[PDB]
Design a protein around this ligand. Structure first.
Ligand SMILES: NC(=O)c1ccc[n+]([C@@H]2O[C@H](COP(=O)([O-])OP(=O)(O)OC[C@H]3O[C@@H](n4cnc5c(N)ncnc54)[C@H](OP(=O)(O)O)[C@@H]3O)[C@@H](O)[C@H]2O)c1
Ligand SMILES: NC(=O)c1ccc[n+]([C@@H]2O[C@H](COP(=O)([O-])OP(=O)(O)OC[C@H]3O[C@@H](n4cnc5c(N)ncnc54)[C@H](OP(=O)(O)O)[C@@H]3O)[C@@H](O)[C@H]2O)c1
Lengths: 366, 366
């Protein structure tokens, strides 16, 4: 037979991640802009069982290794769009920069029809965290894309600088996407809040305990925002395909706000367990500390419920919930995207529930 | 010659108001849904000079007077859509209800092609104000259209009940619109925040004084929301014309959030004067009290700048700014509208400036 024809060919760098895994789905929908799409998906681990049944060409590659990345990605002559949706899992500016440089250096010389590079960073562009994750200290929200860089180390700055330099030299278009806190479904993310809170709720249910809110008063009551992973995928695809969006820094959030107190009530309802909300006068406690000895409990839950096998430290990021629960004043603006014609949105309460439903559907959570 | 043909015929009840005046413009645009539109505009005062040059058929009528309203509106056999964008200027449930009943009782029996009634109320549906406007005490924001009525007097409840009863009996569709704080341009509104703050800035400039923020700490720093009058008009027209939107209660806001501290800086810049922002430890002061003896100063400003003649108490509502500046936690949701397909929005910072620009253009403000 004949080789399949595609309109566009994606390289999704971080296909097992919270946004990469959504791109693996969204790119294959029949009405997705730029379709039909071929999808190459890169990650360091062997292809997990939960991605092996998707029509994605999986490439196992440690992208921090230059020779390996050249060997694995230089043959992919047909790539038209790169979606860089990865990070190394630390704040190290040099090691994160290596990963992204290796992707560009391996693909740019080999993919003659390459058009566009999408770089995913985040709203942490706009604020700093000090004192071991305990002092989140933002200025000037609602955050807009005209705000200047803070005079601090931030690997996002290094990634942007590489993006601008390499795309400019090679007559490629670029986009920088700055998602809000992501609501998604991947059980292999280093920062998946919905999975983290579903794991906590599951452990509470298993132990006949209430869903006890561990966070600060401020984070219980403040306005917060987030972004569905599928909306980030849609936004990245929009910028990849629509000429109006080219060569732009763009925030990405669901378009609305929510409060954690309301999310908490829904989470308890979803798991059929009692809620203990914020108690006046109580200081935040560490969810990471509450959960530090639960690896074996999680293993038993997996077995008892016949879940996809996951390790507690991989499916959940309790440390990340602890940061969320001492954060306030982090709202970002979607005006720039809307004014450029991107009117995608989600109802955040519905998005949170959609992610629970999906993780249950996929047997990541009971 | 021949009588003009129209697709739709609007009765705008409150045409001099902050939303009515915008409907008078939006309804006459060539691409407005349901067009071409004929517009009847009702208000109690004689047609002001600033509305006499618009292609609106002005009807001077005290709609609180049943015999007068019958006499003036019963001949209008061609009305297809009613836009009720008025209130009496007090919280009296009976007198507000009279105005709306009189409109329906005069038009329903006479306008055989009547289709739809749009009722404008507001986000005050969701919360109560106590102690002489000084204790704004909301629960459950972001406010959604599934929230039940509060067990208090609110003329909005009476207006809704009339709307449901009269439309149900007569096979008419209905919509209830609940705008956020409105950003608009009418100098005859009883509650126009932009005009109020422009008047204050103008008086400060005239007196060689700084633009001193008089409000609370909380309102300086909190997230707030608003709605451009033109967006309320668009939203009301959408619900009037699109079958998907019929028989719905619908919030209306710009789709984003802002902070008054940022608005304040822009206002000072716009008037070329020094800003004094919130000062830590200062309690809110009454802007109404600061302005109580300024009627003659405003008269002199009007003369010196050759403005459209306005009385201070009509162009500005300092009492209303005082309420805004002790308000927090009043954000409303636009998810329901968006999920029904209304994707209209404004950048609120740009909307605030657009309203300043328009009031200057129209010579209401220097
Ligand atoms: N998650 C959120 O809530 C959120 C919110 C705002 C912004 N962001 C930003 O989004 C960006 C992307 O992060 P994410 O949260 O989407 O990632 P994530 O869900 O943690 O996924 C990270 C991905 O990178 C891959 N990866 C890591 N090291 C690799 C290596 N050496 N070689 C190949 N693949 C490698 C991982 O695969 P393996 O596991 O096999 O290594 C995985 O596919 C970051 O800048 C992050 O700060 C995230
Ligand atoms: N303004 C805002 O920021 C805001 C925000 C949210 C919700 N809302 C709500 O919107 C609704 C409409 O108010 P608005 O603010 O749009 O009004 P507005 O700008 O104060 O205008 C009121 C209009 O009603 C007319 N009117 C009053 N009494 C009348 C009478 N007896 N006969 C005929 N016309 C009469 C006025 O004309 P004359 O002056 O000639 O009487 C004027 O055209 C209210 O329920 C209000 O609470 C307003």
């Amino acid at each position: 037979g004949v080789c399949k024809s595609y309109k566009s060919v994606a390289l999704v760098v971080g296909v097992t991640g919270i946004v990469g895994s959504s791109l693996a789905e969204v790119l294959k929908l029949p009405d997705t802009p730029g379709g039909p799409w071929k999808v190459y998906g890169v990650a360091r681990r062997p292809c997990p069982v939960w991605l092996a049944k998707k029509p994605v060409e999986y490439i196992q590659c440690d992208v921090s290794n230059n020779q390996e990345t050249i060997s694995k990605l230089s043959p992919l002559k047909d790539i038209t769009h790169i979606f860089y949706v990865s990070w190394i899992g630390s704040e190290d500016c040099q090691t994160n920069a290596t990963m992204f440089k290796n992707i560009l250096n391996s693909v740019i010389p080999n993919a003659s029809n390459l058009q566009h590079v999408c770089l995913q960073t985040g709203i942490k562009h706009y604020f700093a965290i000090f004192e071991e994750g305990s002092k989140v200290v933002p200025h000037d929200s609602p955050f807009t894309e005209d705000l200047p860089r803070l005079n601090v180390p931030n690997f996002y700055h290094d990634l942007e600088d590489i993006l601008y330099e390499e795309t400019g030299k090679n007559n490629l278009t670029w986009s920088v996407h700055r998602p809000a806190l992501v609501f998604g479904f991947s059980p292999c993310s280093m920062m998946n809040i919905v999975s983290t809170l579903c794991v906590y709720a599951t452990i509470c249910k298993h132990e006949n305990k209430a869903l006890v809110y561990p966070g600060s008063k401020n984070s219980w009551n403040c306005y917060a925002d987030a972004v569905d992973a599928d909306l980030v995928a849609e936004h990245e695809i929009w910028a990849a395909v629509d000429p109006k969006a080219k060569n732009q820094v763009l925030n990405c959030n669901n378009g609305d706000v929510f409060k954690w107190k309301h999310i908490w009530k829904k989470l308890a309802e979803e798991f059929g367990i009692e809620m203990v909300g914020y108690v006046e006068g109580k200081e935040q406690v560490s969810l990471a500390e509450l959960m530090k000895d639960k690896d074996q409990v999680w293993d038993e839950i997996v077995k008892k419920n016949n879940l996809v096998p996951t390790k507690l430290k991989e499916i959940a990021a309790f440390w990340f919930a602890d940061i969320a629960f001492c954060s306030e004043n982090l709202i970002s603006s979607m005006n720039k995207s809307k004014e450029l014609g991107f009117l995608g949105f989600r109802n955040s309460m519905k998005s949170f529930v959609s992610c629970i439903d999906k993780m249950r559907d996929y047997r990541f959570i009971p």
